[PDB]
Write an enzyme that holds these catalytic residues in place. Structure first.
Site, short mmCIF file in Angstrom:
data_model
loop_
_atom_site.label_atom_id
_atom_site.label_comp_id
_atom_site.label_asym_id
_atom_site.label_seq_id
_atom_site.Cartn_x
_atom_site.Cartn_y
_atom_site.Cartn_z
N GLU A 1 0.84 -1.20 0.00
CA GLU A 1 0.00 0.00 0.00
C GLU A 1 0.88 1.24 0.00
OE1 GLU A 1 -3.24 2.55 2.69
OE2 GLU A 1 -3.07 0.38 2.93
N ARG B 1 -8.27 2.60 13.28
CA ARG B 1 -9.15 1.53 12.84
C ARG B 1 -9.29 0.51 13.98
NH1 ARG B 1 -11.91 -0.47 8.81
NH2 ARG B 1 -11.33 1.22 7.38
N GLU C 1 -11.24 -7.22 3.43
CA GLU C 1 -10.69 -7.45 4.77
C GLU C 1 -11.62 -8.11 5.80
OE1 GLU C 1 -9.72 -3.13 4.79
OE2 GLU C 1 -7.73 -3.83 5.38
N1 LIG Z 1 -5.76 -12.56 -3.77
C1 LIG Z 1 -5.59 -11.39 -3.13
N2 LIG Z 1 -6.69 -10.92 -2.41
C2 LIG Z 1 -6.78 -9.79 -1.69
C3 LIG Z 1 -5.42 -8.89 -1.69
C4 LIG Z 1 -4.30 -9.46 -2.46
O1 LIG Z 1 -3.21 -8.75 -2.45
N3 LIG Z 1 -4.45 -10.67 -3.14
N4 LIG Z 1 -5.44 -7.59 -0.93
C5 LIG Z 1 -6.46 -7.59 0.27
C6 LIG Z 1 -6.54 -6.32 0.94
S1 LIG Z 1 -5.37 -6.00 2.04
C7 LIG Z 1 -7.66 -5.44 0.56
S2 LIG Z 1 -7.73 -3.90 1.39
C8 LIG Z 1 -8.76 -5.84 -0.52
C9 LIG Z 1 -8.94 -4.79 -1.43
O2 LIG Z 1 -9.99 -5.16 -2.34
P1 LIG Z 1 -10.45 -4.34 -3.31
O3 LIG Z 1 -9.45 -3.96 -4.12
O4 LIG Z 1 -11.51 -4.95 -4.14
O5 LIG Z 1 -11.01 -3.10 -2.60
O6 LIG Z 1 -8.51 -7.14 -1.15
C10 LIG Z 1 -7.95 -8.12 -0.25
N5 LIG Z 1 -7.91 -9.36 -1.00
C1 LIG Z 2 -6.27 1.02 4.42
C2 LIG Z 2 -6.27 2.44 4.86
N1 LIG Z 2 -5.28 3.32 4.39
C3 LIG Z 2 -5.36 4.58 4.85
C4 LIG Z 2 -4.45 5.72 4.52
C5 LIG Z 2 -4.33 6.97 5.56
C6 LIG Z 2 -3.49 7.97 5.21
C7 LIG Z 2 -2.71 7.87 3.86
O1 LIG Z 2 -1.81 8.90 3.44
C8 LIG Z 2 -1.66 10.03 4.34
C9 LIG Z 2 -0.76 11.16 3.71
C10 LIG Z 2 -1.26 11.59 2.33
C11 LIG Z 2 -0.72 12.37 4.61
C12 LIG Z 2 -2.86 6.74 2.98
C13 LIG Z 2 -2.05 6.74 1.68
N2 LIG Z 2 -1.43 6.78 0.71
C14 LIG Z 2 -3.72 5.68 3.30
S1 LIG Z 2 -6.70 4.76 5.91
C15 LIG Z 2 -7.14 3.09 5.72
C16 LIG Z 2 -8.36 2.50 6.45
O2 LIG Z 2 -8.68 1.31 6.33
O3 LIG Z 2 -8.97 3.29 7.16
O1 MOS Z 3 -4.99 -3.97 3.82
MO1 MOS Z 3 -5.60 -3.58 2.44
O2 MOS Z 3 -6.28 -2.04 2.67
S1 MOS Z 3 -4.22 -2.66 1.72
#
Ligand SMILES: Nc1nc2c(c(=O)[nH]1)N[C@H]1C(S)=C(S)[C@@H](COP(=O)(O)O)O[C@H]1N2
Ligand SMILES: Cc1nc(-c2ccc(OCC(C)C)c(C#N)c2)sc1C(=O)O
Ligand code: MOS
Ligand SMILES: Cc1cc2nc3c(=O)[nH]c(=O)nc-3n(C[C@H](O)[C@H](O)[C@H](O)COP(=O)(O)OP(=O)(O)OC[C@H]3O[C@@H](n4cnc5c(N)ncnc54)[C@H](O)[C@@H]3O)c2cc1C
Ligand code: MOS
Ligand code: FES
Ligand code: FES
Lengths: 1290, 98, 49, 49
Positions: free
Chosen positions: A769, A847, A1228
């Site tokens: 990320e 969170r 998640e």
């Molecule tokens: N197969 C697979 N599934 C996954 C991931 C991945 O890297 N590989 N990332 C996870 C995480 S950490 C998140 S936040 C979501 C994001 O899903 P989205 O892109 O549809 O929002 O998928 C989840 N499922």
């Molecule tokens: C998964 C998840 N990621 C979050 C987040 C929070 C601050 C960020 O950047 C801050 C900077 C621009 C000051 C970035 C990025 N890139 C991503 S909040 C969140 C959740 O789940 O709430």
């Molecule tokens: O943990 Mo997933 O929001 S990157």
């Protein structure tokens, strides 16, 4: 000599300059351009480099086929061997093979990076057995790891090779026709005639001499004593790659027939020292099936070891000889060979002796009693005499393919038909720096009788003779010692059973005289059918497989490093800190510069822009002045090849001057080392709350961190253009926007000059990320400085040491409640180990606080959080994002309330559950709260109540094994906790042929985002999906995009795509009207002609978001995803191992867009959960240096790790009006549900403790995460875990 | 091709947006950013693409207005950032038909 | 007699008939559909820069 | 052409008509195949679309 000749996929390869240090994986990728075979670890543990090897065996006079890890296979061992890669059995460009077709259609592929290796493991199997048994089909994947699928789908799909709506139809699967399988290379078969001649190869630093006869081998060893022998290279390969070792001259005896001979003499069966374990296994199994049980006692012993020894890939190349001579303190075979005095035939030019293995063979660490001119020729594993019994045990962290904590070989010989000991040998691995025999303890038993007293003496003996000092290497002192007594106890009980004839033992004991057993799997998936009258073209709601499954199952899917390399492309290897905290007093590159191909060394000084990076500008691109954690990036080396940059990087001398380090959460608290000020959410009256509470409980809990372990590690390719500071980057990341501006900040050029493109990631889970920028920016500087495109893919260990992981949590709670179980007050204070950087650490804590309540109403509550500023690699986001930690602590104290009250847990939980309308502690209405329906449905379909009885009956009838059963619910807040990130863009073009091209800000990592987006556009536009296509993600099509995270990507990008489709449909209307009977193509063309634009943007902003911790008000989430899971386990209170029997999940995804993607997401997140709570554990030295840096020491869930019965269900009739097409985020939310395994285990530990420990029905013992076999065993207190001051106190 | 189209287009956007040309950049031409385009011919490319760019700039200026108003003394950078924060899209298309 | 004569670089991706081309031309649209017609793949699979 | 070349990038040289109008009665590549580095000869037959 010199010429290396082998075949790859039928085609003949003639390498005239084979370099001994070259692996097949590198050859296939660099030289042969076949990127289907991937690199995932390089240690032989993941199997992402699995390929099939076929050769003509003389002795069997037949063609054989076996799997092997390309990353460990030297090419110089492949002379006249036919290699088969993934691309060699099928493809989308021609026709997929049944194996590739099934895995793809079965949803057994998500990010697909592991798919190729798994396709080959299943292929080799089918190539040896065209009709495998469900059991052989599973044992095929012990050397393969998948981090996405949860494994269930991979196994269900392949189950069809063996012997309500459904996710796939096996009747449409094409039957396997062996008469169509690629024939063995005819030419290669003619060569079998010619007599093997001795070959010789000369690489840059090593010389390889392939011996063809024993005489030549002995002569060679005489002339070159120091020369190392290599057969399987599964040992030498690790020492060279990881231990920085250089064996300038190698001899491969593999060809010599006498080293491959198998003989069945009167004393036992003999195997040549080059025979592969898989062969030995095969021979022994047949020997066990044909000979009487009494003669195969030692055989069955070796078999139990080979049973959990690596996987198929390693056992097919690993040599019997190789294992013995390596003399690893934790060898699983040596202990067995010593306890049985296995005959070893050692030779050398002229000499030749045969000695039985015993304690004297292993003088010191990794050393044996062989002469420098000696080589082990053969091994004779002994038949079993009357009144002689054997046993062999091994225990690690994960049952399948793992390095043993403690392993042993146990043998006893009694006087004819008596119970009187004549010979007794107990040999262990994992207790010393070499395999040892507990001679002292076994001596005192000779002539004594096999009885309760002997058992007592021995345990006392072992406990004294095999003691471990606190500073023991590998730690786990208590657990390790307990395992030696427990192992003997099993040996003791088994011998009694065996001294019982049959043609005895206590009724509740025999279970402790039984080897591991796999019960038959049973999985059911149930989701809802689509509206009876829905267009067959409206895919939304149907189980449409991942649009790239087929190409991932064929090796055609392209990942970052798979991208071809430019003729002048250079390689970068990061140079990192080896000290947890210190001053950089000097950097020397004199040694590096001497390495062939060295281009330059980059350091902070070279950066043209600013060295200040990171999400909060509290990080450096390159370390300057001081390093603040082990693995902290100081600089990097650029060279003409990966190998050269690696070697050159390894000799860059950094001289440090240590500084006071703060490693743990403790010191963080102690020294007051935090980031920012406390976080908090308080509601009600605590004082007033406890004051009204019948009972009050206080405690402290700990949850370990976690490594993402995506199969494809971080990777970046930077291409410097040459004009205006322009640069194009191909990166494996989930945040193109940050990659873009961070790269720009480092270079010091406008953001518009940098282009970032993301095809797909072989896994992300949050590890990518933001922490991917660590590699991106470094590669960008090398591109900038050199002018050549540069690339870098981290090795597993680099990825594990640097990228950061999940946040380790420490909680200090206190909960008041009524006898009924009703929570009245709560106070939890969270502390997370943040690393040497803020990064996402802060939003993660929030969170967490938003989830400390899980699914329960708590009138008076207060939760606080702090971020511990430590000298460890900065931790980041991980699937769950703080949520899993908070939910865990919540469920721990909740489980304690149930015990304390003496009430059933489901009851305590259900009565405490939120209700439609209630407000969270952060005051937000729970509209459409469906946990209740999930709870009821799960309880019912899982048969929870009927099974709980079953569980207790078992616990009553079983003394050394218990079963647990727990049912956990969960709710996940959907939306980024930062309001401005809840925006998404999309660009859609319709070309004049009618074909559509969609582009959104979201990236693909295996979750199926692009598939879902195509489905949405196809419904939106009302055209087949075939006319729609998504190629990639790029900063120039959709700018300023939020990272693909928070599980909202489908929710928000789908809305953005949708909007775009609308603009399109609106523009095309006038034409659809003018020509109602026309086609889509007609209207598009008509619009083009009338000069109407066929390109528009789409955008979305999530409404009503913005919570304040200042006033505990304002929505934080758009809605919640709910789910319930019910798991049942069975633990072995004597070893710490356990098996998941069955799990039942009911998830509320609302109206699913794709029930195949969602379920694969549920099963996948669930397995990463059980991984976090019961298997994955990282270790660091006191001074902050990580120990676990590969799959060999970091055990994620394996194929054999999932619940035997895996049932998943998506809640019916419950459309979510808050998101696109009534769906809900599924990314998640389900991961915490893996906690049901943890609490199910704890439940079993209680049963155990009630058996041999306390007698307090309401005792509350602390069990942190992960509940490893070490924690489980140590919590099962007994005479073993249990069994001299001058004066006392009294 | 040497006629100076991209130079002219930058000049137009700089006048349109009322910002220095230095803050504007044109990297290339690609079928995935602007589809179904007529060949760069008939000498109208400046006439028509400049009108298309111009239109785009307008959409941008319109979206950024609320922010320029809320902060008259602010810079271009201030307003853009403010718009990003308020989750206002900073990407639009432009089109022209003679 | 343009100083730079006609020139084209084709990069086959490997998936879905995808191809990226770097061409010296004043008509990317026609390059795109003509290349697609020759290969027999939707126009959305071909990128011209 | 200034764009760097890939490590496995191949080169193409068009084979053209030397007659203003005629029938193609035969094409022989025996000589070509003998040249060092020759990969293949493409003709109408190879076009998939
Ligand atoms: N197969 C697979 N599934 C996954 C991931 C991945 O890297 N590989 N990332 C996870 C995480 S950490 C998140 S936040 C979501 C994001 O899903 P989205 O892109 O549809 O929002 O998928 C989840 N499922
Ligand atoms: C998964 C998840 N990621 C979050 C987040 C929070 C601050 C960020 O950047 C801050 C900077 C621009 C000051 C970035 C990025 N890139 C991503 S909040 C969140 C959740 O789940 O709430
Ligand atoms: O943990 Mo997933 O929001 S990157
Ligand atoms: C993923 C993975 C999982 C593994 N799991 C396990 C496990 O569960 N249990 C366990 O015990 N081990 C395990 N190992 C270790 C491994 O199996 C051994 O070290 C392998 O048996 C050794 O055979 P080899 O042929 O590969 O040896 P090589 O790499 O060739 O190495 C052998 C060493 O022995 C010497 N040698 C070899 N043959 C002879 C001979 N005939 N005469 C004299 N000297 C010789 C060599 O000189 C060298 O020092 C694993 C390795 C990997 C990569
Ligand atoms: O002659 Mo110019 O229109 S191409
Ligand atoms: S890369 Fe070979 S086993 Fe993982
Ligand atoms: S699909 Fe197996 S590791 Fe990603």
């Amino acid at each position: 000599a010199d010429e290396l000749v082998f075949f790859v996929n039928g085609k003949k390869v003639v390498e005239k300059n084979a370099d001994p240090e070259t692996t097949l994986l590198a050859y296939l990728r660099r030289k042969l351009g076949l990127r289907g075979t991937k690199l995932g670890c390089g240690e032989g543990g993941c199997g992402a480099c699995t390929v099939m090897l076929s050769k003509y065996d003389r002795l069997q006079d037949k063609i054989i086929h076996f799997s092997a890890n390309a990353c460990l296979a030297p090419i110089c061992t492949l002379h006249h061997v036919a290699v088969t890669t993934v691309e060699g059995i099928g493809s989308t460009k021609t026709r997929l093979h049944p194996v590739q077709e099934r895995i793809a259609k079965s949803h057994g592929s998500q990010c697909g990076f592991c798919t190729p290796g798994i396709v080959m493991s299943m292929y080799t199997l089918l190539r040896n057995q065209p009709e495998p048994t469900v059991e052989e089909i599973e044992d095929a994947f012990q050397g393969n790891l998948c981090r996405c699928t949860g494994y269930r789908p991979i196994l269900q799909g392949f189950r069809t090779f063996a012997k309500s709506p459904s996710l796939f139809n096996p009747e449409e699967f094409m039957p396997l026709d062996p008469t169509q399988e690629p024939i063995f290379p005819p030419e290669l078969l003619r060569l079998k005639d010619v007599p093997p001649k001795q070959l010789r190869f000369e690489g840059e630093r090593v010389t390889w001499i392939q011996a063809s006869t024993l005489k030549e081998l002995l002569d060679l060893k005489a002339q070159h004593p120091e020369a190392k022998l290599v057969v399987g290279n599964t040992e030498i390969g690790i020492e060279m790659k990881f231990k920085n070792q250089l064996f300038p001259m190698i001899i491969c005896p593999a060809w010599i027939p006498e080293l491959n001979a198998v003989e069945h003499g009167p004393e036992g069966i003999s195997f040549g020292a080059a025979c592969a374990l898989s062969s030995v296994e095969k021979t022994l199994l047949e020997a066990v099936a044909k000979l009487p049980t009494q003669k195969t006692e030692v055989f069955r012993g070796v078999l139990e070891q080979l049973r959990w020894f690596a996987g198929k890939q390693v056992k097919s190349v690993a040599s019997l000889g190789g294992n013995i001579i390596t003399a690893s303190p934790i060898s699983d075979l040596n202990p067995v060979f010593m306890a049985s005095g296995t005959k070893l035939t050692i030779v050398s030019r002229g000499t030749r002796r045969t000695v039985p293995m015993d304690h004297t063979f292993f003088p010191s660490y990794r050393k044996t009693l062989l002469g420098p001119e000696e080589i082990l020729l053969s091994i004779e594993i002994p038949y079993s005499r009357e009144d002689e019994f054997f046993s062999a045990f091994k225990q690690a962290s994960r049952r399948e393919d793992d390095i043993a904590k403690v392993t042993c070989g146990m043998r006893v010989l009694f006087q004819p038909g008596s119970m009187q000991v004549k010979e007794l040998a107990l040999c262990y691995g994992g207790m010393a720096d070499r395999t040892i025999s507990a001679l002292k303890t076994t001596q005192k038993q000779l002539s004594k009788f096999w009885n309760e007293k002997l058992l007592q003496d021995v345990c006392a003996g072992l406990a004294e003779e095999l003691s471990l000092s606190p500073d023991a290497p590998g730690g786990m002192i208590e657990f390790r010692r307990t395992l030696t007594l427990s192992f003997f106890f099993k040996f003791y009980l088994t011998v009694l059973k065996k001294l019982g004839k049959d043609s005895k033992l206590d009724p509740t004991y025999t279970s402790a005289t039984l080897l591991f057993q796999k019960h038959p799997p049973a999985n059911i998936q149930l989701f809802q059918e689509v509206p009876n009258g829905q267009s067959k073209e409206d895919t939304v709601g149907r189980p449409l497989p991942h649009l790239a499954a087929a190409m991932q199952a064929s090796g055609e899917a392209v990942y970052c490093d798979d991208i071809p390399r430019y003729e002048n492309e250079l390689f970068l290897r990061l140079v990192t800190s080896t000290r947890a905290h210190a001053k950089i007093k000097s950097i020397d590159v004199s040694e590096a510069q001497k390495v062939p191909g060295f281009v330059c060394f980059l350091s902070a000084d070279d950066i043209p822009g600013s060295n200040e990076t990171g999400l909060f500008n509290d990080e450096t691109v390159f370390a300057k002045d001081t390093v603040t954690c082990v693995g902290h990036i100081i600089g990097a080396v650029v060279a003409d090849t990966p190998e050269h940059a690696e070697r050159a990087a390894h000799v860059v001398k950094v001289t440090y001057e240590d500084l006071p380090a703060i490693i743990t959460i403790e010191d963080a608290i102690k020294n007051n080392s935090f980031y920012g000020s406390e976080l908090k959410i308080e509601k009600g009256d605590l004082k007033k709350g406890f004051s009204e509470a019948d009972n009050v409980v206080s405690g402290e809990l700990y949850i370990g961190g976690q490594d993402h372990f995506y199969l494809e590690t971080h990777c970046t390719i930077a291409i410097p253009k040459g004009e205006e500071g322009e640069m194009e980057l191909f990166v494996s990341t989930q945040n193109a926007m940050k990659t873009q501006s961070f790269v720009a900040k480092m270079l010091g050029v406008p953001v518009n000059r940098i282009l970032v493109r993301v095809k797909r990631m072989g896994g992300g889970f949050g590890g990518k990320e933001t922490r991917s920028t660590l590699v991106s920016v470094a590669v960008a500087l090398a591109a900038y400085k050199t002018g050549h495109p540069v690339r870098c893919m981290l090795d597993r260990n680099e990825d594990m040491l640097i990228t950061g992981g999940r946040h380790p949590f420490l909680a200090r709670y206190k909960v008041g409640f009524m006898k009924t179980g009703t929570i009245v007050a709560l106070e939890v204070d969270h502390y997370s180990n943040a690393g040497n950087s803020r990064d996402l650490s802060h939003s993660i804590m929030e969170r967490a606080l938003f989830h400390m309540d899980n699914c329960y109403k708590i009138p008076n509550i207060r939760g606080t959080g702090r971020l511990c500023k430590t000298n460890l690699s900065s931790n980041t986001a991980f699937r769950g994002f703080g949520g899993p930690q908070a939910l865990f602590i919540a469920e721990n104290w909740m489980s304690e309330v149930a015990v304390t009250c003496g009430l059933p847990a489901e009851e305590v939980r259900w009565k405490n559950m939120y209700k439609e309308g209630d407000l969270t502690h952060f005051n937000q209405r729970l509209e459409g709260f469906s946990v209740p329906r999930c709870w009821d449905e799960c309880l019912k379909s899982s048969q929870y109540y009927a099974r709980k009885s079953e569980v207790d009956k078992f616990n009553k009838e079983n003394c050394w094994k218990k079963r647990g059963l727990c049912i956990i619910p969960t709710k996940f807040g959907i939306s980024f906790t930062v309001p401005f990130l809840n925006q998404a863009g999309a660009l859609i073009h319709v070309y004049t042929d009618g074909s559509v091209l969609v582009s959104h800000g979201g990236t693909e990592m295996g979750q199926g985002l692009h598939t879902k987006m195509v489905q949405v556009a196809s419904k939106a536009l009302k055209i087949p999906i075939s006319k729609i296509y998504i190629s990639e993600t790029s900063t120039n099509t959709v700018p300023n995009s939020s990272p693909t995270a928070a599980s909202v990507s489908t929710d928000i990008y789908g809305q953005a795509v949708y909007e775009a489709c609308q603009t399109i449909l609106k523009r095309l209307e006038p034409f659809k009207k003018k020509n109602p009977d026309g086609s889509w193509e007609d209207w598009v063309m008509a619009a083009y002609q009338d000069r109407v634009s066929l390109s528009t943007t789409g955008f979305y902003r999530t409404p009503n978001l913005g919570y304040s911790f200042e006033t505990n008000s304002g929505n934080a989430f758009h809605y919640f995803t709910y789910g319930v899971a019910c798991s049942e386990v069975e633990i072995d209170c004597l070893t710490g191992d356990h098996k998941n029997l069955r799990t039942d999940i009911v998830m509320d995804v609302g109206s699913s867009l794709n029930p195949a993607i969602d379920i694969g997401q549920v099963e996948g997140a669930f397995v990463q959960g059980l991984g976090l709570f019961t298997l994955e554990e990282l270790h660091y030295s006191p001074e902050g240096s990580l120990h676990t840096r590969g799959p060999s020491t970091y055990k994620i869930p394996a194929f054999g790790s999932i619940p035997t019965e895996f049932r998943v269900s998506l809640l019916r009739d419950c459309p979510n009006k808050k998101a696109i097409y009534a769906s809900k985020a599924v990314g998640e939310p389900p991961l915490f549900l893996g906690a049901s395994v943890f609490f199910a285990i704890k439940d079993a530990i209680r049963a155990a403790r009630a058996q041999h420990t306390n007698n307090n029905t309401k005792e509350l013992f602390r069990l942190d995460s992960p509940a490893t076999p070490e924690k489980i065993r140590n919590a099962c207190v007994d005479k073993f875990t249990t069994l001299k001051p001058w004066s006392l106190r009294v």
